Amino acid sequence: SVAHGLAWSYYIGYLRLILPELQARIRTYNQHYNRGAVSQRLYILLPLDCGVPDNLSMADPNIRFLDKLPQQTADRAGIKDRVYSNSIYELLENGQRAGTCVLEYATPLQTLFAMSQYSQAGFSREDRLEQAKLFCQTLEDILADAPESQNNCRLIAYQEFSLSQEVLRHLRQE
Template identity: 45%
Template sequence: MYLNDIPLPRGNAAIWSSIIVMFASFTHMSFFTEVKIILQHIVLQLFVSFLAGTMLRLCEFLEECRHVPSRYKNCWKALKASCNLKQYCCGIVTLIVFYCLVHKSKTDGMDFLSSFPWNVSLSCFCYSFFKVFGFLDPTPAEISEICEENKLNVAHGLAWSYYVGYLKLVLPNLEERIKYHQRTSKSVPDCKETWKLYILIPFSCKVHDKLEKADSRIEFSGNLPELCIDRAGIKARSYKHSIYSIYDEKFGPHRCILEYATPLRSLFEMSNDAAAAFSKEQRLEQAKLFYITLENILKNSQECAGYFKLIPYDDDLEEGKIDSHFLSNVILKHMAQERLEYTVPEQSTWKETVNDSLASVEPLMISGSDDPQPLQSKNY
């Protein structure tokens, strides 16, 4: 219930199974006729298939020609978008091999030249039939694989936007603001092992504006000093982080900096807007991909290393089947895990990073409500 079925990256099982099918088919045919004749038929069928596929690509090119002014600007780009270069190369190779086999073949009276026009017409008819009635359309799994490989999913864009436009700005300054807040307030995380931003990632994408409504054992304790950055034309744009007390079963408080991953709200709103045509199943898939993508981005980020903790959980259960304190238990479990696995970054690395950043970036302003005096901060 806590973490349900995180999808793994797709592998090459389909390719390997296709190779097995090819080998089994060839072995079966070899029991009934000579290998040379089998190769002749295979080359003939491949060439005819490539030729029929080319006819379909030309039909698609005719549609794309209508969009040359708005999409491609010239016909050559439209042709490349409609056609598969790999398919054309394979078609030319099979044509050469087919020509050599036909002119050197004298077996069993097989008249390949006389049957060639018939096979081409038949294949073109069948391929066109499949195209018209949608049998050649990619399956949902194929579409998903293409989108994941080429980073075309909604989740990829949201994850990168969340990282570049928010986490990369605020996380490197997190420890400094905690230390500054520690001098003026007692509402700070319990120990340095938990001095990081805990990011909630519910797969239901249900983001509560007040965490107290999600779980009565979560209580707001205060805010860290604001981080002010000149961003996208906005002078001194403010970024805040809230500290919460998470109570265990014995009502002992455990403080941490906690918030939802805000892009999940966009996914939730999209699934409730008919114009977005975004189903609940698609929302769940994109939420999981968002978590996977964000985790990979942050793992490879030197600026954010050690200052975040992602908390994915599946809360999309029927009402009454989920514990009212499910969220607080999940957070406490991650906090306990952090205390066991936490490794403190080397102090020399921290100082080198600060010195390098100060040489090239304008200083930021951190202001706290308890102390109105500004504090110069390092920007990363």
């Protein structure tokens, strides 16, 4: 299926390559570039409506860009020093900073959105929500077999609303 392949590719082609190196990048930030410490783990936003905006402070003013984590580079598929950039956000609650974390959307969910827009994709809008849930479920299943990746990320699946409160609820468990 479409979402089954997308989740396997998101893991093989991305998470598997950044998650084993993430702890060291956060530790390095907290020691030399950082206010309280940035939390560990990549917080992955999984909007089931497949709406992936480019700016997070636009989705919620209580999510404020703080800094970029130091870049990871690696030779990848003929791309010498392929760069992996990730962003740190402050999470506000009633004007106070309530958490700090590395946050981003799972970009393959935007593929489901675009395929439901384009006739040639042969993918209906009526099948999109089921595919979004299957993408999240497959990703959860893969991570359950990859400890080095599972402990370095948190999956934030939601249907619409306060995005910062959704992230904070997950953050307040570690």
